[PDB]
Structures are given as structure tokens and as C-alpha cells.
Amino acid sequence: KVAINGFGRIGRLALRQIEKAHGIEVAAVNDLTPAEMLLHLFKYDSTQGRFQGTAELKDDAIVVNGREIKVFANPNPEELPWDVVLECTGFFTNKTKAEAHIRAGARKVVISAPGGNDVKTVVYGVNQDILDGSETVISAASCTTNCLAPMAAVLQKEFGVVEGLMTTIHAYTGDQNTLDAPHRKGDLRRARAAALNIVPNSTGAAKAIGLVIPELNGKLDGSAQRVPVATGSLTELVSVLERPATKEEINAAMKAASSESYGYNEDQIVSSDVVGIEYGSLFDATQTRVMTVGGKQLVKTVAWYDNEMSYTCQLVRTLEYFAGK
Amino acid sequence: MSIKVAINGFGRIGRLALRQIEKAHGIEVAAVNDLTPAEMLLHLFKYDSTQGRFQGTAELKDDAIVVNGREIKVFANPNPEELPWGELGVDVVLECTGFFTNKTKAEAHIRAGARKVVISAPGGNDVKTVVYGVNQDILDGSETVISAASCTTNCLAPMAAVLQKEFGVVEGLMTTIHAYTGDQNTLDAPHRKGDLRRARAAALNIVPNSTGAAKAIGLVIPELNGKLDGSAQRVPVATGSLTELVSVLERPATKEEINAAMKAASSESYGYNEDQIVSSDVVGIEYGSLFDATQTRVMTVGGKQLVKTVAWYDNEMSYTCQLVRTLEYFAGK
Amino acid sequence: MSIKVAINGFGRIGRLALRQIEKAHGIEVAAVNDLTPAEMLLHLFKYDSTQGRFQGTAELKDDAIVVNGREIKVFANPNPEELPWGELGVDVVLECTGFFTNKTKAEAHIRAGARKVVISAPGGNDVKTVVYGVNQDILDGSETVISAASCTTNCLAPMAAVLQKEFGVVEGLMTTIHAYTGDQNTLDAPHRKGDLRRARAAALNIVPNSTGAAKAIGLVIPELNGKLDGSAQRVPVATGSLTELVSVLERPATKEEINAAMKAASSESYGYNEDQIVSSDVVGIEYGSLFDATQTRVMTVGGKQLVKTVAWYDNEMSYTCQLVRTLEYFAGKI
Amino acid sequence: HMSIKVAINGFGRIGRLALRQIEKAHGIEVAAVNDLTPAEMLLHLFKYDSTQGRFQGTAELKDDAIVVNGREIKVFANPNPEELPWGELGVDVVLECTGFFTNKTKAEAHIRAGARKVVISAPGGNDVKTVVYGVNQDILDGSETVISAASCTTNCLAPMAAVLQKEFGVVEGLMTTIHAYTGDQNTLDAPHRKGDLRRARAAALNIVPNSTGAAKAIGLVIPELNGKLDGSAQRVPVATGSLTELVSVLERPATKEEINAAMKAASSESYGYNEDQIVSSDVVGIEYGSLFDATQTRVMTVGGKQLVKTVAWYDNEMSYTCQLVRTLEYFAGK
Numbered sequence A: 001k002v003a004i005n006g007f008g009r010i011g012r013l014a015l016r017q018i019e020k021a022h023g024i025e026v027a028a029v030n031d032l033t034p035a036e037m038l039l040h041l042f043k044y045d046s047t048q049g050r051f052q053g054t055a056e057l058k059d060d061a062i063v064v065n066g067r068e069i070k071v072f073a074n075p076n077p078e079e080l081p082w083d084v085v086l087e088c089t090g091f092f093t094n095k096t097k098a099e100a101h102i103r104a105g106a107r108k109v110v111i112s113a114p115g116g117n118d119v120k121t122v123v124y125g126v127n128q129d130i131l132d133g134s135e136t137v138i139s140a141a142s143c144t145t146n147c148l149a150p151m152a153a154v155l156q157k158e159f160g161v162v163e164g165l166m167t168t169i170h171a172y173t174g175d176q177n178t179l180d181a182p183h184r185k186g187d188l189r190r191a192r193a194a195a196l197n198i199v200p201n202s203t204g205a206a207k208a209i210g211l212v213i214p215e216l217n218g219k220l221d222g223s224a225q226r227v228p229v230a231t232g233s234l235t236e237l238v239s240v241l242e243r244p245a246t247k248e249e250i251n252a253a254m255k256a257a258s259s260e261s262y263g264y265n266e267d268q269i270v271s272s273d274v275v276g277i278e279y280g281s282l283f284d285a286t287q288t289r290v291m292t293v294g295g296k297q298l299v300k301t302v303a304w305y306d307n308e309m310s311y312t313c314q315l316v317r318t319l320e321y322f323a324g325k
Numbered sequence B: 001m002s003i004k005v006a007i008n009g010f011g012r013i014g015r016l017a018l019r020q021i022e023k024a025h026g027i028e029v030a031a032v033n034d035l036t037p038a039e040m041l042l043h044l045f046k047y048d049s050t051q052g053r054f055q056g057t058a059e060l061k062d063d064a065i066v067v068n069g070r071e072i073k074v075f076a077n078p079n080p081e082e083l084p085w086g087e088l089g090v091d092v093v094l095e096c097t098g099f100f101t102n103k104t105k106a107e108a109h110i111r112a113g114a115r116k117v118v119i120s121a122p123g124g125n126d127v128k129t130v131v132y133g134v135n136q137d138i139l140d141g142s143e144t145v146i147s148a149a150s151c152t153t154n155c156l157a158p159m160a161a162v163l164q165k166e167f168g169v170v171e172g173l174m175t176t177i178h179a180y181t182g183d184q185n186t187l188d189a190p191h192r193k194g195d196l197r198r199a200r201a202a203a204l205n206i207v208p209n210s211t212g213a214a215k216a217i218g219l220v221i222p223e224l225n226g227k228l229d230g231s232a233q234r235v236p237v238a239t240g241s242l243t244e245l246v247s248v249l250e251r252p253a254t255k256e257e258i259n260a261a262m263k264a265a266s267s268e269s270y271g272y273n274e275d276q277i278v279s280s281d282v283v284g285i286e287y288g289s290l291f292d293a294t295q296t297r298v299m300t301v302g303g304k305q306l307v308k309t310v311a312w313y314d315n316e317m318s319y320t321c322q323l324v325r326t327l328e329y330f331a332g333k
Numbered sequence C: 001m002s003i004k005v006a007i008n009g010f011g012r013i014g015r016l017a018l019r020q021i022e023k024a025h026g027i028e029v030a031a032v033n034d035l036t037p038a039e040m041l042l043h044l045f046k047y048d049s050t051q052g053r054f055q056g057t058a059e060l061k062d063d064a065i066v067v068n069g070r071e072i073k074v075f076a077n078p079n080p081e082e083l084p085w086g087e088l089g090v091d092v093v094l095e096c097t098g099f100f101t102n103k104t105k106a107e108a109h110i111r112a113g114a115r116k117v118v119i120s121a122p123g124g125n126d127v128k129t130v131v132y133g134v135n136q137d138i139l140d141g142s143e144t145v146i147s148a149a150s151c152t153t154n155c156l157a158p159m160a161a162v163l164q165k166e167f168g169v170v171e172g173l174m175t176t177i178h179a180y181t182g183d184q185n186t187l188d189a190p191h192r193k194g195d196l197r198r199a200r201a202a203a204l205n206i207v208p209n210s211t212g213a214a215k216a217i218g219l220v221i222p223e224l225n226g227k228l229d230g231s232a233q234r235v236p237v238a239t240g241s242l243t244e245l246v247s248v249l250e251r252p253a254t255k256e257e258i259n260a261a262m263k264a265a266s267s268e269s270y271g272y273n274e275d276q277i278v279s280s281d282v283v284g285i286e287y288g289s290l291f292d293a294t295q296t297r298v299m300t301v302g303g304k305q306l307v308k309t310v311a312w313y314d315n316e317m318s319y320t321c322q323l324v325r326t327l328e329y330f331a332g333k334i
Numbered sequence D: 001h002m003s004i005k006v007a008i009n010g011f012g013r014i015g016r017l018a019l020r021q022i023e024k025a026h027g028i029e030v031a032a033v034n035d036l037t038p039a040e041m042l043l044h045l046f047k048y049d050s051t052q053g054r055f056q057g058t059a060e061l062k063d064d065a066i067v068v069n070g071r072e073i074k075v076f077a078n079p080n081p082e083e084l085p086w087g088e089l090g091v092d093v094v095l096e097c098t099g100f101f102t103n104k105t106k107a108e109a110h111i112r113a114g115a116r117k118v119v120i121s122a123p124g125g126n127d128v129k130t131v132v133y134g135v136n137q138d139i140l141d142g143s144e145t146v147i148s149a150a151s152c153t154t155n156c157l158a159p160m161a162a163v164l165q166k167e168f169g170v171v172e173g174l175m176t177t178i179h180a181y182t183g184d185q186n187t188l189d190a191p192h193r194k195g196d197l198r199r200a201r202a203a204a205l206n207i208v209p210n211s212t213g214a215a216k217a218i219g220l221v222i223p224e225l226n227g228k229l230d231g232s233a234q235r236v237p238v239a240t241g242s243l244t245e246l247v248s249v250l251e252r253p254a255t256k257e258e259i260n261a262a263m264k265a266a267s268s269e270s271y272g273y274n275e276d277q278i279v280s281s282d283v284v285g286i287e288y289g290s291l292f293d294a295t296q297t298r299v300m301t302v303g304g305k306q307l308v309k310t311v312a313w314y315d316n317e318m319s320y321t322c323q324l325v326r327t328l329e330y331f332a333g334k
């Protein structure tokens, strides 16, 4: 029995994915918007396509595949009439703010974002075992961490990482402006028209990797380039390894760790081929480069992800695992 | 002493208005007001994704931007009552926020000490609406708050004026094919005003939306009152737009007669085009409307004629230039 | 005995045509022809920027693709009369290259031994032109080359049929607001066919361009012969379109009457929509045309009425489904 | 006492912008252009440009010529350079901008037609010297007939890579150019002429991985970096304007400030220095071949080991064009 705070991109897609899930179901959503607008945006999606199911608005609820889900329009989480709250508003990104859902009535909580260093942070398929169930607020990290972590863990376990720099070439998101206009958080680059620009912007995914993979703590950093695609992204990591490697060995080790969370690709795919996938990360063997200069090696590895759907499915896999405890 | 202008809302229209007034003689911007620190505003003034780098010097100071050496005071007060327009000797306020679009709200600037307001949007019917080059003569000087109409109205009005004078208009339906604007969302998300179509990702969609522009032609040209209506389709270009009018005229016409009549009426406000241009060629033009003779169609069936005429506009720069022309005329009179 | 189809031009329409024919019974694609090695065609069949991954299996063999376990021979002959259509027993060619869009050019396939050709485009004024759901009865099977018209005609025709049948049309002007297509350049560059507007960067511009969909409507709906014309505005969406028709009707009308008549005429080819949808909601629909009742306008000024009706279409998938409906109907008589 | 008379082969993105730039130059003038198209189309694309704006000058048509700022420029449409009247017109240098003659034997056709020298607007193979103006133009000794102005990415990377090599020493480095899409990509998903499965995909819809030899070419432009760099490209949906990231291991310790101060110290007309929070569209139309962005400099130190990222912007159109013109003027002066 799950509940979704923030019926945004992540919140609405989560409901779509939970609709296919057993033993947990979305019982209620909360947003800042009337139900008619939430229902419309659930049914019709510019990048994820039409919802595959029935969705109609009843009195104070929406009916998805025959079942009723209550809808609320409150900007105060403490005043929510609440087992697990998917926190997807983007405004309660730490334990103190997310503790307000617990004092609204609900037991546990999964923050759909980095939740700080005082909350356990799980990338499903990498370190979900660190959870023992007694946690009240957990974090599923960022979209980029879920892409970076499986690739980086394999590099750490199989060769060891001295250090690495990341570049995520990222779809634009709603925290960028449609056209040039003042930006709420003072970011001079996110203020620019999103669909017209390559936009450099900072990201902490690589620096914070130690929360998911302790043995990479302090070894990675990087930054982002936002580009005019509405969803679909990739993460490059340029690293110095501790032992020699070939492109073939690197790719072979990637394939060995492939799972429902970590896909392995050998086709000449582009970003739109990645829209809607359910892997949290899709390794691209075609982009692996090991460059050797006088015995010294420098390595580039690349993984794709749908920053929307890839993260949503990871959010649901982690949500399911956390519930089984 | 120059006419002293203050800009309320340093947005798309506000910033370009500053650019155009910088090149004008006899008038200068003394202050701008917005919701933002001066550093964010200065950056957006220098760098523009569709209109190019600012061609001039622009520097940051303590609560001010210095444009071509001149200090422009920067305020960040969302209540226009409290702005020091009186203290600064402001003559005219360009009201460009999108939030003070009627007579009583815009009169807060006059209570703050300014003499006149021009609203950069439709301002209600108890405020005169001026499309420069069509009906500015309706001003008699005693007005305090006026409107420069919408971007689309400034595009349609000169085209409709020629059709009415030369042939007479029975009725007409407009379709504006419009660049997306800041009132549309970057990605699918809740929309503040409840618009299920403006809620959708702007650069991904053909987005139908309503507009009162064709109805308001009935105000700029009274002999067209109740005769026009239309709608909009927002499309994924960041600026640059066109207006189509399908009309029933009262007298027979040919494609050549319509085009010749458009050219004869061309001016600094109403341009005349015969090239095979597309919307990006229209970015940054200074005509309020650019008639496209290549798209004129007069279709005759059993004596009955149905006419399509098309004009381009940069919904940003074209409108800004009409806004500045009206401002200069209004400040003189 | 299944109806054997070949696809000439494995492009946007050609590849989607294979997807739809794969789901059909009694008809199957035996071969495709393009100017390209099979790996490139297999790759593009599998991966599609606007229509999504192929929902099925697709693998490469020697100069052939295997779709859902079935071999489809692949050819690369740019001259269609040298294709082995007769030898393979090909009943119908879907002509989707954009280079053989009249009777003389498309007859190459009959010279190569195929029995019938359907052109996925306007085929000129001297070939039967069919919008499925409007006029497929004009076919008796003895035709050798027919046209399924353009994407816009399949959008315009069902809407215009209702207006003509229910109210009578004096005249009308169309505007299609259309996704950019492959006949426009990626960036500003010389254009092969000399069009100064299609030369411009497709995804940066509103691009006026001509279209014969309304002017040629008389081939599909005889009572509208010579009564419509119109034009296009190409805009930066990669697929998905709408058609506006501004018309003068012969008798008075209300928006509700127009909308009710559209819904009454709705079918698998002609959808009826009442939601506040935008173009991306229309990518991948199977209606040839989706009428939008929210955009209907009847304007009355001193008794005189001017009418606007608007219909959506996925110029890719909407047209493809119309092409396959026409193909199936044509093959059941051939 | 005669101005340098230039012919432009390929009136494309680079060809047309080169004409704009040469019009502003003293001592050099365009005498003719050649393409595959009638003069009306070339004139139209010269006046109107979706990313670089309207031409700021006069441009009119005549009988098989364009008149730019009052001066006549002859227009030809012959696709074999052997037959061009380069000798008869006294053409000193040909800017080879077609993308179809990017090696020495193909480009020497302009010499056989009567021209004295050729500059290829692209990598030209290894038996043609590759010149990035401001980095290595002194390698020309005058005896060259055919030279290359390299690629846009090589012109972006080279001044940045030169400062790091001279000031700190470079062990190795990997490049990623995040690059505007170009005309070698398809408008929508379609077969690709050269068999590239990613450039086959819709350009304005995708992040498109693609290979580039730019980082390897630095080993030719800056011989002390031979064999030390490689990299690749991601084409993204902006119509022009790009950046190049370099992740490198240096030979001596460095800080962000030292790296930036050295970049600023080397700035010139070719190599710009930026400290503002700019995005790609701010770079459209710049005349630097490379614009270093001090705001993206990163030095990461982990247990004494350092890894360095430096980033430079470029307008792959105008930045390269101005580099092309500088190289032309220098090459023409010998």
C-alpha cells in the first residue's frame, strides 16, 4: 500500500509502473493541483506516450483500471491524512523535511531524490542489501546515480578505480526555463531556454557515490551538459584504473553483471531508443575506449538511461524490496 | 531632458524594450523592476538565446545595471505601489510583467509617482488599445493608462485594415501559428491557470490555444466590430510567428489587387515581403507585422470568393518595436 | 494462399507498413527493396525515433531480414523493372520511395511481374485515388495502379465528406499544420527539387509549403471537385499533424450539429476526440483522421456563417494504417 | 597590385559563411562560387540563414551570377572541378567546401583547372598539411599547393591542448565533443549514404554518438602530442554551436587557477577566454576558433593523482569559418 507525494513526472510514471505491481498499490496521491489536471497529465504524456489503461475522475478520486485512488491538493505534508510515501515533490529532499510525512500519519518513506548523508541511499541492484527494514526514511538517489553506480561498481570490483571524472549528457528537465527568464534558484544557466541550448550545470552524483559504493568514496567527480532532448540521457565516466584493462574485458565484465536493473547494449542506439526502458542503467559496449600511452591507460565507459522511466523503475524496485521487511 | 521610462517586468518584452529604447533619441530607461537580483537580470540582458548578444556594454553595480555607461536603477519590489517612480521623476512606465494588465492595477504606477502607463498586453476595454500605425490618433493626451494590444493584434490589425478599406470584410476567421512562450511548460506538468494544453511540453507539441486577438480588432478598427474571430496553434519555435486570416470580402478581389494594396500601405510598422521566407528570417525584425504576398490566395467558386492573407511577426521584437513607437507617441502627446 | 506484398522504399511509410502488415491475416510481406544493405534496414526497422522499438523479433540473415521468425528477402535494385516480382509471385507492390509517384513510373512494377501497385502518395490526376472509409468502393479489382493519396487527404476527406453530405459546401480553404518530413533539409542547404522553403532547416522553422490535398479532393469526393484549396505550414515536430478547414456551407449550422455529425460518422478510419489533446498524443494512432470537436467554430455575422473544423493525424501511422486498409481491400478483389 | 581572387567550391554552410567573412576582408575577394544549384537558390540561402541571421549587406541576382555589395560574383553549377574556369578567371585559391574532395588527388582538380592553391575546409588526408591557425601555420613553407584547415573540433581543441602541453605536459587525454548536428545527419530516421547507423537517425531528436579523428589530429597539429589523445562525439539537437571537453592526465601538478591563468595568457583573435555562465547559443556567430570556458575547469586530486577536465566552446560554423579565412589569408600571402 503506497502513496505518492508530488504527481509530477516521477510520481505519475511511478503509478504507471506500480499498476503492474503485486502486493503494493497506489492508494492516494497529493499535489498542488486539481484532480482534473492531474488526471489529464496521467492519461496523456508527451514523452512516455498514452497511458495503457483506463483512467477517469470520480468524486475526490481517480479510477485507474476500475480501482479508486484518492487525490489531495495540499502544499503542507504534515496536514496529509495518511504504509510508504513516495516523496516526489523535489521540495523535501532531506530527513527533517521528509520527517513531516511521518508526522502526517504514514510509516516509512522513500525519497525520490538524494536524501542527504544521514539517510541510507540505495541504488537497486548495487546495494539494496544494506537495508534491514527498520529504516523510516530512505533515498533512492538521483537518476544519474542509478545510471552511474552499476557501471562504476563493476569498474571498482574488477579493476579498481584510482579516480574518475563523469560527464552526463542529460535531457532537459522542468527545472530549466522554457525561454530565457529569471530562474527561481538563481542558476544563470538553467535560466536559459531549455530546448535551444547545451547548458552546463553541476551535479553531485559522482561525488556522492560513496553512499552507494563506499570503496569509491572520494574517487569520482563530474558535471552535466543539458541538451535539447525531452527525455533520455547518458553518463560518460573517464577513469584511471588500478590494473590494466582492455575494451573487451571491460565489456565482458559489464555483461556479466547485467540484470533487470543493469542492461547491456551492443547496438548502435541513440537516445530516443532509450525512452521508456525499464533498466536503471544500460551499458553501451560500443562506446568503451581504453587508451594506452607508454603503458599508461585512460578509460572511457558509457551507460544510457531514461532519466524518467529508468529512474522510476529503480524507484519501484527499491520500493518493493523495502516493503518486504 | 529625455522622457524617463521605467520598465516593470524585465522579461522577454521588458529586456528587448530596453534594447530598443537605448537606440532611440529623446527617451531613456531610468529604472527597471523585477523579482530578481541585479546579477540575474544583467546576465539575461547581455545574453539572449533568440535575439543575440546585447550589442553594447552592460556591467553590474550595487543595485543597478550600467548600460552603455548609464546607470539604471534595479528594484525587486513585487508591489508596484512602493516603487520610487516619483522620487526618480519617471514619466512613463512600460508595464511588462503580465500581472498588472488592467486599469486599476496599472494605476499603482501613477500612485507611485509616474505620469503615464503603457500596458504591454491587452489591458481591458476601459483602457484604449493602440496598434501603432493603425489607430494611435485616438489618443487625446488626457489618458494615463493605455494598452499596446497583443503581439497578434499588432500583426493582424494592419492587414485587416487594408482589407476593410479596400474591399470591405463580411467576416473572417484567424489562425495564428505561434511560437511557444513562457506561459507554456518546459515538460508536461501542472499549469498555474488550469490550461490543459499549455500544461504540455512546449517544444514537443502543436498546442491549440485560444486568443482574443481577432475579436479585439473590433476595438482597434471599429468597423470590424463583431466581424472577426480565431484561435492559435502554438508550435516548437522559440520565437517567430505568423497570422492567417480567411475572410469573406464584400467586393471581388484578386491576389494581385490584395498584394498591391498591402504594399501601398507599407510603412515602418507594416512591412511588405515577396520572398520565400520562413519563420527564423523574421526573428528580430522591427516591423510590427510583415505581410507575405507569396501566401495570398483568392479562391473563386461559382462567383463566391474566399480569401486567405498571411502576415509574419516576431511576437517578441515586432511587438517590442510597436510598444516603443506607441510609447514615444504617447509620451509626446 | 496468402496475399504476397513487396515494399519498394523501406522508409518511414515503408517500414511502418511492414509493422502493420505483420499484424494482418491473409497478407504478408515477401520482400522489400531499397538502395541499402540489409543491416541498415534491419537497424531502422528495429529502432524508430518517433514510433518506438519494434514490438517483435527482427534478426539479420544473408541479404534478408527475419521478422517474427519469417524470412523477408531484401533487394537493393534502384530500377524497379529489374526486380524479380513475377518470379516470387508478388501480388501487390507498396510503392513508398517517393520516386515513382505516377502511373508511368509505377508501372515498372507491373513490367517486373507484380500484379498490382498501390502508390503511397498522390499519383497524379489519372489514377484512382482512395481514402479508405470514404471511397474504396470505386475499386473493382481490375485496376493495376492506384493511389492511396497523401497523409493530408486522408485527414481532410472524412471531415469534408460529412460537411458535404450534411450541409453542402460552397467552398473552403484548408491549412495543414504539419510535422516536418524527409523532403526538408536538416540545415539550410540547396534543395534537390528547387524549393526555397524546404531548403531550410526543418526543426528550426515554420515553413510554408504547397499541398494539393484540398485541390485534388475531387478524385476522392466527387461532389467537392473544384470547391477546396489550401496550403501547408511545416513546423518543428517530428511527426503528428492537424488539418484546419475554413468553409462556407450551403445551409446554417451549429458547432453541436457539426460535432454530432462527425461522431455519427466515426469508424476505425475516422476517430472522434473530445479531450484537450496536443500533437504528441496523436503519434502512433491508427485512425486515418481524428476529428477534434473542441476546435469546431461556427461564426455568425449578420446571418452569414463561416465554419472551422479541425482534425488530427499522425502523418506517419495514420496514413500507414489507411494504406494497409486500402491494400487489404484492393487485394481482396485483385 | 591585384587583390587575391578566391573561388568557393561548395556554397554550403561553410562556403556561404566564408563569403560573408571574405566580404569583410581587405586584400582578398571572392571571384566565383560553384555548387550543384541554380543561382537563385544560392542567392536565397546567402541572404537568409536560419542560425547565422540575414546577410548584412546587399545581394541581388543576375544572369548566372550574384551581386554582393555591388560587385559581381560568377556562379557555376558544374559538379566536376576539372571543368571550372579557374584559370580563365585568374583564381588564386579555391576554398574546397563540398565535403566531396577531401584528399589531395581529388582536390588537385582545381589546380588543373587553373587555380594556384587549394584549401580544404576539412581534414584532407595525411599527405596534405593540416593547419590550425594560431597553433601551427608556420609549418607551411609556401611550396604547398593543397592544404587543410582541419575540422571544427581540431580548431577548438588545439589551442587549449597547446597551453596544457607547454605549461604542464600532457601524459594522455580523452576528448568528448558535444556537437551540434550537421548536414551529414538525416532529418528523420532513414538510410544513410555512408552506412553510419547513428547518423541515419533523426538529427533534432537524438543524442547521437559518433566518431571523430579530431583528437588524433592534434598529434599532427601539435607534434609533441603525437599518439597522446583520442576521443569521440555526441551530436545533440542544437543546429549550431558546440563544445569540446578534454579529460587529461598532466605531467606536473596543476590548479584550476593556474590552468585558467595560462589559458587567458594565450588568448588571441583565434583563442578566446570566457568567464561568464554562457550556454551554446551565446556562441553562435563568434569569430574565435575556440572560446575557453574557465567556469568549467576541474582539477580532481585523489591521493596525489590528478585528473583534469578543460572545456572550450566553438561555433562549428562561424568559428571554423573564421579559422578557415585566417589560414587562407596566411596561405595566400606566401
Ligand SMILES: NC(=O)c1ccc[n+]([C@@H]2O[C@H](COP(=O)([O-])OP(=O)(O)OC[C@H]3O[C@@H](n4cnc5c(N)ncnc54)[C@H](O)[C@@H]3O)[C@@H](O)[C@H]2O)c1
Pocket: A005, A006, A007, A008, A009, A010, A011, A030, A031, A032, A033, A074, A075, A076, A088, A089, A090, A091, A093, A112, A113, A142, A143, A144, A173, A174, A307, A308, A311, B188, B189, B190
Ligand atoms: N525529472 C527527472 O528526470 C528526475 C530524475 C531523477 C530524480 N528526479 C527528482 O524527482 C523529484 C521530482 O522531480 P520531477 O521530475 O517529478 O519534477 P516535476 O516538476 O514534474 O514534479 C513536481 C510535481 O509535484 C508538484 N509539487 C511541487 N511542490 C509540491 C508540494 N509541496 N506538495 C505537493 N506537490 C508538489 C508539482 O506541481 C509537480 O506536479 C525531484 O527531487 C527531482 O530531482 C527527477
Ligand SMILES: NC(=O)c1ccc[n+]([C@@H]2O[C@H](COP(=O)([O-])OP(=O)(O)OC[C@H]3O[C@@H](n4cnc5c(N)ncnc54)[C@H](O)[C@@H]3O)[C@@H](O)[C@H]2O)c1
Pocket: A180, A181, A182, B008, B009, B010, B011, B012, B013, B014, B033, B034, B035, B036, B077, B078, B079, B096, B097, B098, B099, B101, B120, B121, B150, B151, B152, B181, B182, B315, B316, B319
Ligand atoms: N513574449 C511575447 O511574445 C509577447 C508578445 C506580446 C506581448 N507579450 C506580453 O508581455 C508581457 C510580458 O511577457 P513576456 O513574454 O516578456 O513574459 P516573461 O515571463 O518573459 O517576463 C515577465 C517578467 O515579469 C517579472 N515579474 C512577474 N511578476 C512581477 C511582479 N509582480 N513585479 C515585478 N516583476 C514581476 C518576471 O520575473 C519576468 O521576468 C505579458 O503580458 C505578455 O502577454 C508577450
Ligand SMILES: NC(=O)c1ccc[n+]([C@@H]2O[C@H](COP(=O)([O-])OP(=O)(O)OC[C@H]3O[C@@H](n4cnc5c(N)ncnc54)[C@H](O)[C@@H]3O)[C@@H](O)[C@H]2O)c1
Pocket: C008, C009, C010, C011, C012, C013, C014, C033, C034, C035, C077, C078, C079, C096, C097, C098, C099, C101, C120, C121, C150, C151, C181, C182, C315, C316, C319, D189, D190, D191
Ligand atoms: N512521411 C510521411 O509523413 C508521409 C505520409 C504520407 C505519404 N508519404 C509519401 O510516401 C513516400 C515515402 O515517404 P517517406 O517519408 O517514407 O520517405 P523516406 O525518405 O523516409 O523513405 C524513402 C525510402 O525509399 C528509398 N528509395 C529512394 N529511391 C529509391 C529507389 N529508386 N528504389 C528503391 N528505394 C528507393 C530511400 O532510400 C528511403 O529508404 C513519398 O511519396 C511520401 O510523399 C509520406
Ligand SMILES: NC(=O)c1ccc[n+]([C@@H]2O[C@H](COP(=O)([O-])OP(=O)(O)OC[C@H]3O[C@@H](n4cnc5c(N)ncnc54)[C@H](O)[C@@H]3O)[C@@H](O)[C@H]2O)c1
Pocket: C188, C189, C190, D009, D010, D011, D012, D013, D014, D015, D034, D035, D036, D078, D079, D080, D097, D098, D099, D100, D102, D121, D122, D150, D151, D152, D182, D183, D316, D317, D320
Ligand atoms: N558544418 C560544420 O560545422 C563544419 C565545420 C568544419 C568543417 N566542415 C566541413 O566543410 C565541408 C562542407 O560542410 P557543410 O556543413 O558546409 O556541408 P553542406 O552540405 O552544407 O555544404 C556542401 C555543399 O557542397 C555542394 N556540393 C556537393 N557536391 C558538390 C560537387 N560535386 N560540386 C559542387 N558542389 C557540390 C552541396 O550542394 C552543398 O551546398 C565538409 O567537408 C564538412 O565536414 C563542416
Ligand SMILES: [Cl-]
Pocket: A165, A166, A221, A222, A223, D298, D309
Ligand atoms: Cl567536471
Ligand SMILES: [Cl-]
Pocket: B173, B174, B229, B230, B231, C297, C308
Ligand atoms: Cl476558431
Ligand SMILES: [Cl-]
Pocket: B297, B308, C173, C174, C229, C230, C231
Ligand atoms: Cl491557401
Ligand SMILES: [Cl-]
Pocket: A289, A300, D174, D175, D230, D231, D232
Ligand atoms: Cl572515446
